[PDB]
Symmetry: D2
């Protein structure tokens, strides 16, 4: 069985508890931008009292072209992640793209993220589970909610019970995602923390719509939110990045909605 309340030192993540923020940037553009963005997140989450985990990729492994910017790479990113972790004493979450990378990533990262497209790749899942870090499972665009249980079951079989499921939209026809809010209940009924990646659910593979979608998801009662920002969204996924100057009022509303929704008695309408 998976852990219903996933603990990370001081932080407790669960669908009935105050929501936790996995927040940061899409990719490590530079040391100075990462430090600036982290400082902005930590300060805001401290004043709003939202538990916080810093998020950034060391590699964009699945871009369209071989020449697209991929980031600092494994060696430099893991080194840079430690710099952010040691200076601020903040947890780290990043994604893992090849099985061998799991253990070296686990030294620095408190939560290791399983990318959507790779969530079925057994070698990557087994290697990630072995490190014993928390595992954030990105729900694939092509998988139905009930299919999440097998990814949990494979993780449990591989000896890891610190598991989080993260919604990021479902394929809706061509070049378009929809978020089925009814899917949140199905995943919550698996008794794991459930997160919503609002940033990547806007994609039309809609920055003005991030507020609408985050509210709808968090109104269902979720363990946390996954969010990316940038001071000037115009090096990767800029159309989905939230203008960093808008972070605090955005988080403040979500904090208030969550508080209302988390205090509701669950209602059985069977």
């Amino acid at each position: 069985k998976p852990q219903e309340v996933v603990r990370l030192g001081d932080i407790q993540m669960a669908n009935h508890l105050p929501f936790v923020l996995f927040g940061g940037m899409n990719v490590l553009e530079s040391k100075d931008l990462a430090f600036e963005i982290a400082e902005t997140y930590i300060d805001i989450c401290k004043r709003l009292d939202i538990p916080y985990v810093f998020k950034a990729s060391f590699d964009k492994a699945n871009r369209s072209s071989l020449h697209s910017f991929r980031g600092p790479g494994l060696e430099k990113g893991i080194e840079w992640l430690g710099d952010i972790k040691k200076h601020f004493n903040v947890p780290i979450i990043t994604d893992v793209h090849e099985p061998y990378q799991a253990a070296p990533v686990a030294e620095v990262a408190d939560i290791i993220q399983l990318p959507a497209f790779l969530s079925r790749q057994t070698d990557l899942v087994e290697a990630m589970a072995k490190t014993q870090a928390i595992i954030n499972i990105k729900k694939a665009q092509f998988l139905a909610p009930h299919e999440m249980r097998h990814i949990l079951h494979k993780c449990l079989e591989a000896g890891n019970d610190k598991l989080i499921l993260c919604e990021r939209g479902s394929a809706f026809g061509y070049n378009n995602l929809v978020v089925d809010m009814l899917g949140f209940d199905i995943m919550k009924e698996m008794n794991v923390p459930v997160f919503f990646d609002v940033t990547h659910a806007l994609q039309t593979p809609r920055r003005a719509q991030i507020t609408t979608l985050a509210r709808a998801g968090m109104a269902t009662g979720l363990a946390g939110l996954f969010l990316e920002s940038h001071p000037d969204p115009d090096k990767c996924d800029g159309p989905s990045a939230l203008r960093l100057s808008q972070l605090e009022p955005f988080l403040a509303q979500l904090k208030e909605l969550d508080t209302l929704v988390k205090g509701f008695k669950k209602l059985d309408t069977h």
Copy 2:
């Protein structure tokens, strides 16, 4: 005669996307005169104590059932009589759906809001005959139409001289025998500057494929986007409802359901709007 009304008024009631949400609530079909009175009384009392504006909803005819022999309700003449009886006895406004152009004028005598069914929303003669009555028009968004396509149906209503128009979401076809609600679609319909409603009841359907246990989660998600109102069907015993019982809310649970949505709506309508363009 070009623009629709951003605020739709019905006596004391005001419907708009920035205003407190309004409930179109009742039952799927007029199963009997006595049950309709009981259901209306129950909605009216709950909405008064919770302070939620209310319009009673019930169909007089199920025009699109699976079989020729399926239960259809009282029909036009008797159904209009029951709706008027409810309206006069309770002093409550009425919404019901219209299926043929000739039904439009007699239904509008009793119904303050006349509903355009999803499958029929493009049928020009029905849309025109409905527009002519000058009643409020509730447009059900078809399972197969994208949000931006609602603009043409508004224009057709406006062309026929009616500007009291509401758009009501009820799910989109998602593969076979399944609906999904695209919450991003609400913003597109609101930018048309008409009141936009959410029919949570029919957005649960798995047509030809119930999900009654998920109604609260879905209604919370929709109303958190900030909408003009909610469309809802209930029944004292949904297993025996004469149509769409699998999606009906247990009447005994109406009050705690609405109570949560009332506070959520108040919270959301009170947020400062945020420019993220």
Copy 3:
């Protein structure tokens, strides 16, 4: 009165999934009496030389256009006159669509096959009034209905006493503003033991989103599954067709298009059936 006819007969013509394919072909709407005569003559000559059974198709009314002012065609009285004129002059059978229950009986005087529009395929009064006329019924499969759901519409037609029934594929909603044809859906409808047709013209649509250049590939794929017939709209100048011009086949290309499909059909209908269960 329980079972539908596996072989649907119309004088000399026989329609069934194991028989040579039949063409329901013509134009989207009766744009004018003269153009309808020209188009009918062109189909009839080509089908005779290629030896393809033929039914002339044209709508007398576009009942579901975007605007109240969009071109709708001649309407009921005049359209029925033009269809009868074509029928008597050319000695050709007629298929046209029916939009309201009262239109069913007068249309059936002239039309040998009456067509049930997709959006209306569940409307009980229309289905019954159509069934009563005892004409052949062409059922358009709605963009939002799964194949197995056609069984209920057949049953409703049978309940109302008509067993001359055809199912016609025309695409399924695939996300927003897009249709896909599920070729596996053809087998499900054929196992209902009725003739199954393919409306390749409307399966190209990108509704609210043309694909005229892909019509041959799509028609070949469908007819390779082994079908009772094809539904097709053409126009001498598709850019100026009064409705659905983006999906119309250029009339000058009708003969090479049909010639390929004729040989493909003959090949496929002559294959030994194979049990892979």
Copy 4:
């Protein structure tokens, strides 16, 4: 630019040419079953005059459970593939799951297959392209047809021009695939050989329906077909495996349809 006609020694693959068969089994169950199945394919394709490439995976890398049968693995499969290749003098096609495997797989395999879920992973694509074998691109369930160009463009940027696109269905709602036959024209208009994997397009993640679907796809005019069989479909993907005793009449019909369709003058209906 990619090669419009992809050559493999004696075999020529192109959308206007006689269709080529990539045929075999889902997974290498055992040496005896693989030898028996290959013998049956080679004999039938010889008598029907259909050019043939033998297909089998050495690993099922993306199964639901860690304990599901995965096959002989890399070392044994590459060794076993050589046994099939040397005895019969038949080309080999198999799929590659991790970047390092590309070069060792390329020694034995004439065509290396890019799995659908991984088609966007740059490290795997680059490593596969480097080996200079033919690359069969499985079109992801979540990608639209026009998106195939980037996978070609990345391959060309990586110095490989022997490219094949292979359709295998698109996500249609939950747990269901549909094959959009209009997508074949879009991929053919990219001037590469286009194949149809009918076996995996039946999936409802329908054995009696394989005949219907293969005919519809091949009626559009394709460079080839991808097909899996098993003597008793009841160790992997058995619901989609064709009963081996039915192979020859199935192929005979497709040979006849292809001949008709390939002789049609292309018709411009713009």
